[PDB]
Design a protein around this ligand. Sequence first.
Ligand SMILES: Nc1ncnc2c1ncn2[C@@H]1O[C@H](COP(=O)(O)OP(=O)(O)NP(=O)(O)O)[C@@H](O)[C@H]1O
Ligand SMILES: [Mg+2]
Length: 538
Amino acid sequence: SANHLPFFFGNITREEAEDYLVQGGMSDGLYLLRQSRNYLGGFALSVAHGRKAHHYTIERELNGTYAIAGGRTHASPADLCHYHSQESDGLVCLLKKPFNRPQGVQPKTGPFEDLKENLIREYVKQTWNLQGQALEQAIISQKPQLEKLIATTAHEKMPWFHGKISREESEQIVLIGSKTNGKFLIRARDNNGSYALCLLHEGKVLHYRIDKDKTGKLSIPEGKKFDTLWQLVEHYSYKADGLLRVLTVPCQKREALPMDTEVFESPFADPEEIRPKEVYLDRKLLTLEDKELGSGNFGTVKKGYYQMKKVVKTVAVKILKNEANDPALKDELLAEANVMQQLDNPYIVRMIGICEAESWMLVMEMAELGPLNKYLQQNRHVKDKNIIELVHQVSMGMKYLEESNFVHRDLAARNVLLVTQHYAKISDFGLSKALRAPVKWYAPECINYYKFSSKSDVWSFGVLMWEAFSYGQKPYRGMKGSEVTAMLEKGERMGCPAGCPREMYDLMNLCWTYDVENRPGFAAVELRLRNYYYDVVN
Ligand SMILES: Nc1ncnc2c1ncn2[C@@H]1O[C@H](COP(=O)(O)OP(=O)(O)NP(=O)(O)O)[C@@H](O)[C@H]1O
Ligand SMILES: [Mg+2]
């Protein structure tokens, strides 16, 4: 807890924190503390310097201590702030003057805020019937979109809404049990937007009227206007305004979201569907379209249809080149295909199985919008926040591959395929290894020692992030491979793309760590990306 700190604001947005620093005059070293927007019990420090706001995630360590970017440990966020008032230790400047919560503003950390994580979890379970890893993977990518969604749900299902209870009933229900100050409920006074807010204050029930104006807005007499009871409760849980005190505990009574697609879950998630007993698929159940979707170094891709029990599944089929028919390649191709088929995550193009027919055929999930680099080059109106969402999903798919001890070897924007504008999937994982086989995407140890690992996939991910933020431009423009190797040895790197956030360019640079040992793994990359994504996207 940090509620005792007068400059601690709780769970506010990054923009609200910047608005407060502007309110405080934007002087160099002016700062405030807030809660990390990730449900991980961390904090965020917002500092003014050179007329810009600088934000840093404070992570809670396993032993209950706190640190920024794997840096030094601090006993508490107050102690971290004190240390940073004398030594920068990586921050833009020293912490000079705190911006205290204005008069009448309490930390945004009450029971209303606490309910959010479980509400989003319950919303995914109910809306999409997701469980286990599919459920956790939905939440991690879509937390900001899901928080916006739960705010629009009907007030009647909220724990603080008691419906058509009378004034006398509300009085008795607010008084039963422990007399927690701020204990409250909302009841309907009629069926035309008239409500009452009953609040416990030093053992007495206060009955406030909530009325709907001609413009459809809700308010208490002379109070701030709100479009919903959700917004009204959120506000009053940290700014009492016209109330005697804040609300606390409720009284006891092409643009689709990833989960809205048929490829979010595995085609075999339905227990009545027949999962193939091995890597092989029945060619008799597969139909290909005449026209190709494209081609590459390993084969041609066509749209296809795979006959299953309940439905016909639209698939993408990669028909491998004649070179893959060589008997010398067979065992490793089949061995890699088996391992590809084991992989199951929403952020990868799942490899359904293989057909040994006229040619070797890899049957995959369909990602109809095609590759990320070509999509961004054709759709330059795609916002920076949408690119962050897409690259974060790639870091999730890669975290899963790393956990599965699977090295991609060709991670690049051409190998990130879009199901929707808000749903990316990693494709062609392990294909270059399967076919016994791009230098601009290779880590220095790959070109020098042929050492491919999850760490060299991290390096590739940095180049991919650069491609994404550059709207599908080519990396190291016009340079030969030898010039790229020499430039990297000098410690030089590609520049920050136009409009690319500074935290995203710092993450690229971290992926481009020369030394393999010091380069982060995908767990660290995904978490750093997730923290930034959750702080900027509201
Ligand atoms: N699962 C898929 N779903 C939909 N389209 C796909 C899928 N896989 C590949 N494609 C399409 O086929 C095109 C070529 O794929 P591919 O043969 O993997 O070449 P590439 O990745 O561009 N270059 P390379 O590294 O040489 O293979 C892509 O640009 C996509 O348009
Ligand atoms: Mg490819």
